[PDB]
Amino acid sequence: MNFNVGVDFPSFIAWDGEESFPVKVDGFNQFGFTFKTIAALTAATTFNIFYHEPSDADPCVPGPAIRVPEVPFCDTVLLSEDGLAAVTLPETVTPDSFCAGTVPCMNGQWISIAPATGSETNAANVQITVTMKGATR
Amino acid sequence: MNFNVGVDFPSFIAWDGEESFPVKVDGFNQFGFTFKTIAALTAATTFNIFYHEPSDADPCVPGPAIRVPEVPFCDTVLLSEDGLAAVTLPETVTPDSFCAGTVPCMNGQWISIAPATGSETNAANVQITVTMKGATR
Amino acid sequence: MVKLNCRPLCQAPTASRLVSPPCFICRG
Amino acid sequence: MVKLNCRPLCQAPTASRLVSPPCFICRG
Amino acid sequence: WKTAFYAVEKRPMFFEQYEGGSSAWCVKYQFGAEDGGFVGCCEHGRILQI
């Protein structure tokens, strides 16, 4: 008895393994990532996060690819060199479990993920997508 | 305040435009599809649905793909001619327009979608993902 | 048989060419 | 530190104009 | 318009649970009504055009 969960928490391809994809999030108010592997991996992968703004052309083309900053929690207490909240998928993970990342603070209307340097080759076996929670039309 | 909706309604790629990806649905009790357009298309693209089974060579990898027998609703006046279950996005759907669907009754552990005959070259643009919403364990 | 709800995403504003009938009285 | 205050002796007036809804060619 | 155009009502709106074609899990409904309309002497009105 599966409901019409297409609407009411949809989802869209994010990082396919070859090219990123800007996804609109203005649409909703809560969203999150789902990472997946397709085969065995190598040295843990690193992914940088980027945000876009409405380009002055199409008032709906994600603009440039600017990087979302990093914000700490009460005890985040652990800080990268810069801010620029990124993620690192640890290796030794089988294609039978998933990873659930979510940035707490958003800015813009188009989230995007990019394979950080020294990971693209190992990131080619990674499939990332994003799903939202609200409707807020 | 976007919660980590990675866990608690995850999502996975179903169709990137080049190949299918059988996805397990065992751990979840409900699920649904999501369709997205990347460029204006020429025809009402059609898709065939298939369900797999745990292959007895290894009870982790799915077996072959079987066409699923959609059960029609009580007033489904026009039902599947012989293509027991399938889907067909209407023509003249533009990007930034997500689509939703689901089947009423499942019969396996893995779901897969393929570009039905004659609609392949137009299916190389639409992306398809699946969202599941069960825990069951 | 699978349905296809859309409730599409982005929204293009309209613009409008509101008239306010032009100025004249001439008939010939 | 230096709690600068920054305040002037002279000041010109706010020389400004007045647009008023001008000549109505009345659309053609 | 009290003489230019007339409407006719035959039987008002009815709704019903259509018996048959419905299981112990499914229920089918059917409804309808009957109406129509005609023009009287249409020399009682002017229709402005361009």
The answer to whether A113 touches A20, Cβ cutoff 8 Å, is: yes
D26 touches chain C (CB under 8 A): yes
The answer to whether B131 touches B35, Cβ cutoff 8 Å, is: no
Q: State whether residue E47 is helix, strand or coil.
A: coil
Helix or strand (DSSP H, E) at E17 = strand E5-17
Burial class, B112, CB count within 10 angstroms (exposed 0-12 / middle 13-18 / buried 19+): buried
Quoted resolution (Å): 4.0
Those chains having 3 or more beta-carbon pairs within 8 angstroms of chain C are A, B, D
Residue A68's φ and ψ, nearest 5 degrees, are -70, 135
For residue A53, give every residue at least 6 positions away whose Cβ sits within 8 Å of its Cβ, in sequence order, or none.
Answer: A62, A63, A64, A66, A108, A109, A110
The answer to whether A4 touches B31, Cβ cutoff 8 Å, is: no
Using the beta-carbon criterion (under 8 Å), do C5 and A24 form an inter-chain contact? no
| Separation in Å, CA of E26 to nearest CA in chain B | 6
Q: By C-alpha distance, which of A68, A20, A47, A49 is closest to A117? A: A47
Using the beta-carbon criterion (under 8 Å), do C10 and A137 form an inter-chain contact? no
The answer to whether B122 touches B45, Cβ cutoff 8 Å, is: yes
For residue B22, give every residue at least 6 positions away whose Cβ sits within 8 Å of its Cβ, in sequence order, or none.
Answer: B52, B62, B65, B110, B111, B112
Residue A14: strand pairing partners? none
Q: Do chains D and E touch (3 or more CB pairs under 8 A)?
A: no
The answer to whether A48 touches A113, Cβ cutoff 8 Å, is: yes
For residue E4, give every residue at least 6 positions away whose Cβ sits within 8 Å of its Cβ, in sequence order, or none.
Answer: E39, E40, E41, E42, E44, E45
For residue E21, CA distances in Å to A51, B69, B105, C1 come to: 54, 21, 21, 18
What secondary structure letter does DSSP report for B123?
H
Please report residues of B whose CB lies closer than 8 A to that of A55.
Answer: none
| Separation in Å, CA of A1 to nearest CA in chain C | 14
